[PDB]
Amino acid sequence: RGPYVQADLAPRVSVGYDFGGWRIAADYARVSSLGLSAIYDFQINDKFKPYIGARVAYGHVRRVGLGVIAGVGFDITPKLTLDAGYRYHNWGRLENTRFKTHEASLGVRYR
């Protein structure tokens, strides 16, 4: 695919590049909020398909955490694409669960 810009809305400004199955792009929001976003998929069809990935959130001038995303996305054309789903937020502490959150949001990719 190539380079492209991503957006998050429930806004957040993200950017990165993709190829087809694995897409990489960082997220930024307003001290400032900086994080990484990574989407992955493995399905083929006409349009509108599921998607799963992970993203980390890092806040500092502190809010350091890691979460995941998953849902469904569609796009009639390669230029612009739309996605929607839910994402969980993990604070991080131990390796046996403790505190996890979940929210619903949608994003869009544009040139």
Beta bridge partners of 81: 109
DSSP, residue by residue, 18-68: E-SSEEEEEEEE--EEEEEEEEE----SSS-EEEEEEEEEEEE--EEEEEE
Amino acid identity for residue 35 in this structure:
G
- Distance, in Å, from the CA atom of 70 to the CA atom of 48, rounded to the nearest integer, reads 14
The CATH number of residue 79's host domain is 2.40.160.20
Tokens of 89: 């937020």
Check residue 21 and give left, alpha or beta (phi > 0: left; psi -120 to 50: alpha).
alpha
Query: What's the total number of domains in the chain?
Result: 1
Q: Nearest to residue 109, comparing CAs of 2, 7, 3, 1?
A: 7
- 45 touches 37 (CB < 8 A): no
Question: What is the C-alpha to C-alpha distance for residues 91 and 49, in angstroms, rounded to an integer?
Answer: 29
Q: Tell me which residue range forms the domain holding 16.
A: 2-110
Which single residue is written with the structure tokens 């796009």?
75
Task: Give the end-to-end CA distance of the chain in Å, rounded to a whole number.
Answer: 12
Residue 101 amino acid letter: T
